[PDB]
Amino acid sequence: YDGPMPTPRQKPFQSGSTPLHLTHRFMVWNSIGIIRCYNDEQDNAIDVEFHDTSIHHATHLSNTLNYTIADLSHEAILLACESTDELASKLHCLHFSSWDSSKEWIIDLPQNEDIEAICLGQGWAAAATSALLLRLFTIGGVQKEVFSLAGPVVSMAGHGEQLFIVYHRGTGFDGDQCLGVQLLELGKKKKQILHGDPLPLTRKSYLAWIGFSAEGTPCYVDSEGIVRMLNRGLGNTWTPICNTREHCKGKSDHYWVVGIHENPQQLRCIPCKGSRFPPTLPRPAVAILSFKLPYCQIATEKGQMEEQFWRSVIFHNHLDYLAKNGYEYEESTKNQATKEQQELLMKMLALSCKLEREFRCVELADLMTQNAVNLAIKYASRSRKLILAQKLSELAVEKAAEL
Amino acid sequence: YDGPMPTPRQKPFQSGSTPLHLTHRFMVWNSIGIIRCYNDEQDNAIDVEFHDTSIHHATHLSNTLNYTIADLSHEAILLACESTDELASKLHCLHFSSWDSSKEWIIDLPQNEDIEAICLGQGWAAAATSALLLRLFTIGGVQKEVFSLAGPVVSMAGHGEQLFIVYHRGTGFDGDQCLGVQLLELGKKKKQILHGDPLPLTRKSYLAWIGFSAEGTPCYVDSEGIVRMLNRGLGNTWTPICNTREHCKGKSDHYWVVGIHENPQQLRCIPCKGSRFPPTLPRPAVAILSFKLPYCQIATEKGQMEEQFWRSVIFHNHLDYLAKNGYEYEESTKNQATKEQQELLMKMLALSCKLEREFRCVELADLMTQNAVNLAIKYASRSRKLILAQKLSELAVEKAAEL
Amino acid sequence: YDGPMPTPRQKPFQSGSTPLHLTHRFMVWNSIGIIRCYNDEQDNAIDVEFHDTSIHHATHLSNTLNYTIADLSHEAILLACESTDELASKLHCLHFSSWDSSKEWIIDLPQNEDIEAICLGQGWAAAATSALLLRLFTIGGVQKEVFSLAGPVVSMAGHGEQLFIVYHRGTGFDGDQCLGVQLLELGKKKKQILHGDPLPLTRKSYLAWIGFSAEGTPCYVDSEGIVRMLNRGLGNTWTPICNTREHCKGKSDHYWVVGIHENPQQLRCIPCKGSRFPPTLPRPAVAILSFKLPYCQIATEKGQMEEQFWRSVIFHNHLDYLAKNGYEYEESTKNQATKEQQELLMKMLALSCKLEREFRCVELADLMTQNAVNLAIKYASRSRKLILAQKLSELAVEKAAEL
Known part of the structure; x- marks a missing residue:
């Protein structure tokens, strides 16, 4: 027939890695450091580098078992290899931050089970296998819980107690993927935040990068340069926070995301000219792109300020998340966010008052604090906006009644 | 091959509208009023009518921008048009209920982004776009939050703070659609009630109409005349409340739903002979169909009363919803519902007592109030049903212990 | 084309039944009893047997209406038949445990509606029909609520107030099914525990058996012998608890699951040599297989004990479920579980202390009670593990601060 065609499911990948066929490739490049693998026919070596030299010294490994998957954190180095006709699939952890004399452990998966993706959390590690299983491990080597995956894994990320899994929930058509997200919190009270929700993607695009911001918010990038972030303040929906294609000059130009930071706001990525991933040598330079939510009429003063307001709102939801989960947060950052938004x-x-849009002023005052509304009433008494001042006063009465 | 074939995804639509190819079509017909569009080659006009003349006067617009999507509420008129090679896709709002001198605003979507569906809520408006984005706006023109859609939108409805989105979650086969529902509450505490749950449809049917009842409960109709309503008292499942095919005499006869009302119960629709939508002229007459849940043996006294009981139960769940969300509800309606159900x-x-089904009597008494159970005990003492009276007494003891 | 092919959706089935084409088949075999159907061209008979003769006497029925679906519980016998050109689809209940003189009722489904699956709960019965409807009935014959199914039903099970529905949520490819699970609790407060979550299955496998453990935990088995159980302590994920292929000697050998028991742990199934289901005659013998979670390096002492620990954890989550829902549970079983896990x-x-893995010891102590941690501190003071004793002491301080 001549209709819709099933889209081939994209293969699993480690975010921040370059393809395996390269002689000198990146196994992982994140906010902690870089892991490179040089593999030809004579020797196979793995090199680990930390952005902060104080964290740990540079580590060089002889990749005898041919590790093809890697992840890096401030605690350990995680390595994995598939099975051969003689050896099993292995998960290798270099627990360099350990305070004891045993800074290494390795475990063999059962027969005919191959590791397809790994990720490092705070004190734990996870591995998605070809048996549609997710295996949890402590950073010291204890096997934790195991559960089944609803589909083949695509990519996996971890941060703190959060586990971020993206998998194939179905079969897409006409170039579209059919991806689902399972988001778990693995603290003392286990929670499945997302029970396989559909992962929004740009049409005819595939998943390019997933992970967490440094502050701990899930984020991901598709092959069309669209960067999306979980909106905890909007029912756990996904909000676009950047479009790297706006910074590209041609079709062949791309950006290779390395990390995402919310405070200060910056998208750390590698500009790539001619391909989607940077070459290993020479060392690429990390660019810093700004976040921009896709708002309408952003060239106008109204659209510009509306984008700045909602960007400030979504990039400070992490403070509430750190508070609800007992984590440590700066109360000064929360106060500066509110002051920035009230301004x-x-x-x-x-601006709406200058445009004689007084109903719009009351709508904006609904988002204000009680002090800001009281100030807007006196600004409305000024300039002879008598009815607007009355509507704002009635809004101030309603706000005081909500307490 | 000769097997299952992928079903073509149905296109987005505004509920209560007639096809675009008509010279004189309905843009929207709901419980607020009617919006008609007369478009030939000479001129293009849009006419707005309100069922209650006291709400607003009849509005006539010169459709210069060729608006093809419309929605109407007691607050404003919402209009949208796709982009051309010279103009962008535009969202136009006629805020006629505004208390200020600015009763109009329009906004341009970014380049290559087209509005595919709109809907009006209480004080807000939403637009689903070709970029798989949902854009929120205040009724006065402020851009609110934005998030990504898991698939192409099919239809969109709003009521109060609730947002009702139906989209393609996958690809169906053999004439079936693969639809998912995202139900959000956009109050001060944002909630995603349904995280893309599968939307039940009759086999080989497509979505024909969505919306809310006047009381605020999500409802939708498929192309097979099956009307379904959210059952808040049953874990947010979907319950069939009507089958318009029972009122049709032939295959070519259809009913065109306009509105749904829970108190008093009535399904307002337009009878259509020969097609699925009524012609614009002459003015069609609104028919009032009764709701009937698809219960078994409804011709018998038992089945008839069982249908009346559960229809009364589901059509009064909205009272609890209005109470939980601080809305205004009549306590008399709640008391009449309970009296109707206890009767x-x-x-x-x-009836079960006459049929010597005394175990069934105790099951029915489990649904009764404590006063009704006490009355059933004395009715069981009468007519010499001694064991039944003892079982009902033990049930009355258990009910008092649950307090 | 030469790519992925749509997998044909598997047909609905009753768990614990043998195919319909057999002259003498099992309609259901569970922990309550056995129901056999002998059907040739001369006569059609249904025989009911109870494992405990004290529950009820053996029941023999003349299958005049040709019932093809059956379920059995300690309360009643449930039977169903499809519609013919003269008769409607019927649901028949033999309420043998009733304390009144009416121990039978039957109901006819509407025209062109056929029962596809049934299941028995505590005091209620459910039927999934060809109209994508789920109909609830009390065990005495009262019609309860009705709601629509998101897809064609595959199998249905009940236990207490829980309803376990597995249905087709989509179309799989390359031999894979696309199944979803809807798990409801039908008590006085209706809850939808799982809003159509994807049902994990082994690749290229279909659903073979579903149901609940005797303690009330949902479980299911796929065609590859993988037995999975709901993990209430892990965000309602699904954990593999057995692999019946490990007990098989060849490809043609299979195990036919009958029941699952958590305390004592045992998987009651019928060994089948040459087919997937046992012949009705002679009476097959029920085998008892042990549960084994698929943990790595299970031949080692570490892997063996880790499997025993997490198997003990998941097989005692039902005690917390019985407590949260007011059910009756033995406090002694809860105490023996903790003692077994702390040992x-x-x-x-x-073992980790002998291997000089002192960081791993602290990780294991995080799972311990405060008394066990205090004991581990004195064991660390012994054998001159001074730093380990300090880390355990600081952990004991942190545990006391969490109260």
Whole structure:
């Protein structure tokens, strides 16, 4: 027939890695460091580098078992290899931060089970296998819980107690993938935050990179340069926070995401001219792109301030998440966020007042604090906006009644 | 091959509209009013009518931008048009209920982004775009939050703070659609009630109409005349509440749903002979169909009363929803519902008692109030049903212990 | 084309039944009893047997209506038949445990609606029909709630107030099924525990058996012998608890699951040589297989004890479920479970201490009770593990601070 064709399911990958066929490739490049693998026919070597030299010294390994998957954190180095006709699939951990004399452990998966993806969390490690199993391990080598995956894994990321799994929930058509996300919190009270929700992607695009921001919010990038971030303040939906194609000059130009930071806001990525991944040598330079939510009429003052407001809102939801889970957060960052947002609301209200849009001013005042609304009432008494001042006063009464 | 064939995904639509190819078509017909579009080669006009003349005067617009999507509420008129080679896709709002002198605003979507569906809520508006984005706007023109859709939108509806999105979650086979529902509450505490649950449909049917009842419960109709309603009292499942094919006399006869009302119960729709949608002229007459849940042996007294009981139960769940969300509800309606249900239970218990089904009587008494159970005990002492009276007494003891 | 092919959706089935084409087949074989159907051209008979003769006497029925689906519980016998050109699809219940003189009821489904699956709960019965409807009935014959199914049903099971539905959520490819699970609790507070989550299956396998353990935990088996159980302590994920292929000697050997028991742990199944289901005559013998979670390096002492620990953890989650839902549970079973787990942790800590893996000892002590940690501190003071004793002491301080 001549209709929709099933899209081939994309293969699993480690975020921040370059393809396996390269002689000198990146196994992982994140906010902790870089892991490179030089593999020809004579020898196979793995080199580990840390951005902060104080964390650990440079580590060089002789890749005898031919490790093809790697992840790096401030605690350990995680390595994995598939099975051969003689050896089993192995998970290798270099626990360099351990305070004891045993800084290494390795485990063999059962017969005919191959590791397809790994990720490192805070004090734990996870491995998705060809048996549609997810195996949890402590950073010291204890086997934790095991559960089955609803489909073949695509990529896996970890941060703190959070586990971020993207897998094939179905079969897409006409170039589209059919991906689902399983988001778990592996603390003392186990929670499945997302029960295989559909992962939004740009049409005819595939998954290019997943992970967490340094502050601990799940994020991912598709092959069309669209960067999306979990919106905890919007029912755990996914909000686009950047479009790396706006910084590209041609079709063959791409950006290779390395890390995401919310405070200060910066998207650390490698500019790539001619391909989607940078060559290992010479050392590529990390670029810093700004985040921009895809808002309408962003060239106008209204659209510009509206984008700045909602970007400030979503990039400070992590403070509430750190508070709800007992983590440590700076109360000063929370206060600066509110002041930054109340200033943008106040400037947007003054703009709507100049445009004689007084109903819009009351809508903006609904997002304001009680102090900001009281200030907007006196600004409305000024400039002879008498009815607007009355509507704002009635809004201030309603806000005080909500307490 | 000769097997299952992929079903073509149905295109987005506005509920209560007639096809675009008509010279004189309905853009939207709901419980607020009617919006018609007359478009030939000479001129293009849009006419707005309100069922209640006291709400607003009849509005006539010169459709210069060729708006093809429309929605209507007691607050504003929402219009949208796709992009051309010279103009961008635009969202136009006629805020006629505004108390200020600015009763109009329009916004341009970014390049190559087209509006595919719109809907109006209480004080807000939403637009699903070709970029798989959902854009939220206040009724006054402020851009609110934005998040990505898991698939191409099919239809969109709003009521109060609730957002009702139906989209393609996959690809169906053999005439079946693969639809998912995302139900959000956009109040001060954002909630995603349904994380893309599968939307039940009749086999080989497509989505024909979605929306909310006047009381605020999500409902939808498929192409086979099956009307389904969210069952908040049954874990947010979907319960069939009507079958418009029972009122049709032939295959070519159809009913075109306009609105759904829970108190009093009535399904307002347009009878259509020969097609699925009514012609614009002459003005079609609104028919009132009754709701009937698809219960077994409904011709018998037992099945008839069982259908009346569960229809009364599901059509009063909205009272609990209005109470939990601080909305205003009549306590008298809640009391009349319970009295209506306790009377049906009492008549079903008397029927089971006549049939010497005393175990069934105790099952019916489990659904009764403590006062109704005490009354059933004295009715069981009467007519010499001594063991039944003892079982009902032990049930009354258990009910008092649950407090 | 030459690519992925759509997998034909498997047909609905009753767990514990043998195919319909057999002259003498099992309609259901569970922990309550056996129901056999002998059907040739001369006569059609249904025989009911109870494992405990004290429950009820053996029942013999003349299958005049040609019932093809059956389920059995300690309360009633449930039978169902499809519709013919003269008769409707019927649901028949033999309420043998009733304390009244009416121990039978039957109901007719509407025109062109056929029963596809049934299941028995505590005091209720459910039937999934060809109209994508789920109909609830009390054990005495009262019609309860009705809601629509997101797809064609595959199998259905019930236990207490829990309803376990597996259905087709999509179309799989290359031999894979696309199954979803809807898990409901039908008590006085209706809850949808699983909103159509994807059902994990072994690749290229179909669903072979579903049901609940005697303690009330959902479980299911695929065609590759993998037995999975709901992990309530792991965010309602699914954990493999057995692999019946490890007990098979050849490809043609299979195990036919009958029941699952958590305390004592035993998987009751019928060994089958040459086919997937046992012949009705002679009476097959019920085998008892042990549960084994698929852990790595299970031949080693570490892997063996780690498997025993997590098997003990998951097979005692039902005690917490019985407690949260007011059910009756033995506090002695909960105490024996903790003692069994603290002993395994203590032996694993002593093993890690012998291997000079002191960081791993602290990880194991995190899973210990406060008394077990205090004991591990004195064991660490012994054998001159001074730093380990300090780390365990700081862990004991942190545990006391969590109260």
